[PDB]
């Protein structure tokens, strides 16, 4: 499996109820390891996975110092964005930042990214070459110009190609018994009527890690896409995931329908049916 | 590890 380290940042201006809300979370793959929350009583970057806890006080202090400096950057940002888009102070607004890096099977670098959003939409994003920017609109061109002139791309690339990958690999090694586990799906199927001559076959996958899965449905060998309902993958709350796929099916024909399950924790792919 | 460089205001 390929691996990834990402950070997600959310700033929300609350006009007249004081300073902005700031929440920062970090992930290795589908496992969250750190949070910072500006309303939480600690004002510290906190652990959220047991393998990060073995990092010393120097790690925590430095991560707090860094994350507060993110929060201060976003606190200014909200007011500048206001001016760019000619908005008054009285309205609440959001900025989101996401950055991080990918490695492959051998843990060599794959890709790095830094994307930035204002009020839901794309604002500015760093391209895959890591040396250039995509501005979404005319306001974001003033950022793009500023960020070129300060050589922000150069500083960020040193992190994404460098520090991000080293620390990714370190976390991978220190939490090997959790991050490099695969949990296979436990699978079953349910059958439910919707009329006297129609039935729903629902194909289920539970207790699996990582979140990448692919439920498909076939009829007599060939796949059926368009009576298919696929729900969004959801957390079970214990670090594992859940998903289902459904099909509206004419009654007495459940036998010709097979559910196919692919996941990285399965040697051969699974096949469930009803006949 | 968060970045400690390469973040700037818009």
């Amino acid at each position, epitope marked *: 499996g390929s691996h990834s380290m990402r950070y997600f940042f959310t700033s929300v201006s609350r006009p007249g109820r004081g300073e902005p809300r700031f929440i920062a979370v970090g992930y290795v793959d589908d496992t969250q390891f750190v949070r910072f929350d500006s309303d939480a009583a600690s004002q510290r970057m906190e652990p959220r996975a047991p393998w990060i806890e073995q990092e010393g006080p*120097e790690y925590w202090d*430095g991560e707090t*110092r*860094k994350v*507060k*400096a*993110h929060s*201060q*950057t976003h*606190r*200014v940002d909200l007011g*500048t964005l206001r001016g760019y888009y000619n908005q008054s102070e009285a309205g609440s607004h959001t900025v989101q930042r996401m950055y991080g890096c990918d490695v492959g099977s051998d843990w060599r670098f794959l890709r790095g990214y830094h994307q930035y959003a204002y009020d839901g939409k794309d604002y500015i994003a760093l391209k895959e070459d890591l040396r250039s920017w995509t501005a979404a609109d005319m306001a974001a061109q003033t950022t793009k110009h500023k960020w070129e002139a*300060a050589h922000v791309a*150069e*500083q960020l690339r*040193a992190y994404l190609e*460098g*520090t991000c990958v080293e620390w990714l690999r370190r976390y991978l090694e220190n939490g090997k018994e959790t991050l490099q586990r695969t949990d296979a799906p436990k699978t079953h199927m349910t059958h439910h009527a919707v009329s006297d001559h129609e039935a729903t076959l629902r194909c289920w996958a539970l207790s699996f890690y990582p979140a990448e899965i692919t439920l498909t449905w076939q009829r007599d060998g060939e796949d059926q896409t368009q009576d298919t309902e696929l729900v969004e993958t959801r957390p079970a709350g214990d670090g594992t995931f859940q998903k289902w796929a459904a099909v509206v099916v004419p009654s007495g024909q459940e036998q010709r329908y097979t559910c196919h399950v692919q996941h990285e924790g399965l040697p051969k792919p699974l096949t469930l049916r009803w006949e | 590890e968060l*970045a*400690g*460089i*390469g*973040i*700037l*205001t818009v």
Partner: T-cell receptor
Amino acid sequence: AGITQSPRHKVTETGTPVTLRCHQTENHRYMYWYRQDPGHGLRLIHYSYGVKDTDKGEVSDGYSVSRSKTEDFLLTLESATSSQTSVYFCAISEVGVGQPQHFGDGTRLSILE
Amino acid sequence: QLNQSPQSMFIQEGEDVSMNCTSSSIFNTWLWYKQDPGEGPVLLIALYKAGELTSNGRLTAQFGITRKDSFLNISASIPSDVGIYFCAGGTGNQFYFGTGTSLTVIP
């Protein structure tokens, strides 16, 4: 014309209030007042993230500070003591993470009994 | 308060100058400054990863893999290189400075 300090030189007696003023054009940024001493190097007195928002450095005692506009960062010494004879420097950082600090030209202050 | 060695060096003109800093905390940027008598410190080099960021001119600087280390080399020195030299280490939002090395150039 970057950063300006005023005054560049002041010779005054003990007990006198002294304000050092630091001005920058560029716009929204972090501002810092440091002092330079023969053995100690640059020690930080006070800093500022923005307007009305200041915090202490390693040697803040006998000093105050004020940020009414983004352009101005006033270092004030309410009753000058002789130990505050020094060379004082204003510095400037862009808002972000890990940005380099650019320095003013210095203010040399003599406080005499 | 950062460990800068040497404190003072007297060097003959045309030769090379070396100075270094040591820390106990990890930093993510290393900066090097020059100060002339009467003026402020002026930023010479800003470093962002390990390996050697080469120059404004005859000045080369390095930044340790362990991130607790940096050094400055000035080659083929010149009489106008006299002054005090400072390293700086950045922790996110603030900077810690070395004690300085005073360079003077024998002509």
